Amino acid sequence: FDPTELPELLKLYYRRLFPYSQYYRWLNYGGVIKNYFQHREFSFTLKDDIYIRYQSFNNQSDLEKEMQAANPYKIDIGAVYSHRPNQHNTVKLGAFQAQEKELVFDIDMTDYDDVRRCCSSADICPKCWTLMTMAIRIIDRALKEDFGFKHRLWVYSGRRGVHCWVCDESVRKLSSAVRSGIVEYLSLVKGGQDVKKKVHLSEKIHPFIRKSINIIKKYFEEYALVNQDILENKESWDKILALVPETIHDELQQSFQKSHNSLQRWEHLKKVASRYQNNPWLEWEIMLQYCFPRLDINVSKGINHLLKSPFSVHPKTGRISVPIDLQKVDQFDPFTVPTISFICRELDAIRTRDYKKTSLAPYVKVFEHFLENLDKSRKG
Ligand SMILES: [Zn+2]
Numbered sequence: 495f496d497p498t499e500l501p502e503l504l505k506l507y508y509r510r511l512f513p514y515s516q517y518y519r520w521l522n523y524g525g526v527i528k529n530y531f532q533h534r535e536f537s538f539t540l541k542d543d544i545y546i547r548y549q550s551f552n553n554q555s556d557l558e559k560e561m562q563a564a565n566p567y568k569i570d571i572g573a574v575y576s577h578r579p580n581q582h583n584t585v586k587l588g589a590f591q592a593q594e595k596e597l598v599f600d601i602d603m604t605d606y607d608d609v610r611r612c613c614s615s616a617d618i619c620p621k622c623w624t625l626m627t628m629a630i631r632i633i634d635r636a637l638k639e640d641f642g643f644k645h646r647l648w649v650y651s652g653r654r655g656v657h658c659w660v661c662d663e664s665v666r667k668l669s670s671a672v673r674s675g676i677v678e679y680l681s682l683v684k685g686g687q688d689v690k691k692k693v694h695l696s697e698k699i700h701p702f703i704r705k706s707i708n709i710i711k712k713y714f715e716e717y718a719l720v721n722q723d724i725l726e727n728k729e730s731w732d733k734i735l736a737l738v739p740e741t742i743h744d745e746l747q748q749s750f751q752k753s754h755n756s757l758q759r760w761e762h763l764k765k766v767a768s769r770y771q772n773n774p775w776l777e778w779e780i781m782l783q784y785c786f787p788r789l790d791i792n793v794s795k796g797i798n799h800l801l802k803s804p805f806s807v808h809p810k811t812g813r814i815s816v817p818i819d820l821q822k823v824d825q826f827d828p829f830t831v832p833t834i835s836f837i838c839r840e841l842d843a844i845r846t847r848d849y850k851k852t853s854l855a856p857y858v859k860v861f862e863h864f865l866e867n868l869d870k871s872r873k874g
Pocket of ligand 1: 612613617618619620621622623
């Protein structure tokens with residue numbers, strides 16, 4: 495993909511491919527509440543990194559217009575405010591308030607750099623992507639079963655990770671404190687870089703943790719012991735020994751030297767750890783520390799947080815911020831995700847149905863099913 499064709503591709507994409515209809519369907523929420531879409535903040539990042547926020551629009555047409563006119567490189571969605579963001583200059587200090595917004599999560603592969611061996615920073619590969627899969631399943635399960643959130647839209651970030659938009663009516667009215675509490679409930683991996691051991695479990699295991707572990711169990715052998723090979727050599731297995739008491743270090747060190755692969759060594763770790771318990775949950779603390787999601791509280795805490803819009807175009811990979819079908823989550827592949835050049839290619843090889851003829855269609859379908867359930871909930 496070539497980022498210089500981009501300003502030309504954006505023109506076309508924003509004119510004949512970006513699903514404005516479904517977009518407005520989403521953000522207008524069936525018109526039940528007035529000025530909801532009209533009080534929504536957007537922000538655009540234009541060429542040469544020109545950043546503008548407090549963008550608001552009268553309706554879908556105004557949006558189509560200003561977007562096609564600006565042709566932004568980045569689009570971020572924000573809160574629904576007390577007034578129209580456009581007019582924020584006209585509002586007296588103290589009355590311009592973010593009032594409602596979807597509950598959002600940002601999962602970023604870069605946050606796993608201390609426990610994945612294949613890549614670092616913004617690099618991703620099929621061997622580490624399984625981490626997202628566990629993250630989506632682990633978290634979405636909690637949002638659905640523990641919290642009863644019914645309308646959850648998962649979106650590819652374009653390069654390094656995934657977003658979740660929780661859009662239930664009661665959720666959009668959640669205070670920053672409750673949001674922060676939901677993040678604290680979901681969070682198990684605590685610490686920065688000074689701290690080598692980021693997971694400590696109590697004698698009693700809360701169901702969320704149990705159900706998260708059981709999801710990780712299903713993936714751990716292939717992800718961690720085979721593909722990542724976290725016990726390949728001493729440099730790697732010392733990092734794991736750093737997460738367990740010193741009194742079992744020597745025993746494990748020898749059993750690791752005498753062993754041939756990570757499966758054997760993990761199986762040894764299990765037996766020694768289990769034996770350590772009798773006279774605690776080391777295995778699970780290690781699995782969690784190596785596979786459980788890391789969550790930035792600042793992303794989900796603030797009602798005024800601006801997050802990458804679905805169907806944005808990634809300035810470098812060219813990939814589309816596409817919705818993720820929760821039913822096929824294990825089959826999701828960020829490397830076969832449509833790029834803008836590909837869907838413009840498809841378009842220039844054939845009115846409101848042009849995108850259906852592109853590879854963009856099934857993701858818009860996922861988005862439409864997300865919208866349909868959203869209507870049904872408003873009705874009954
Ligand atoms: Zn990788």
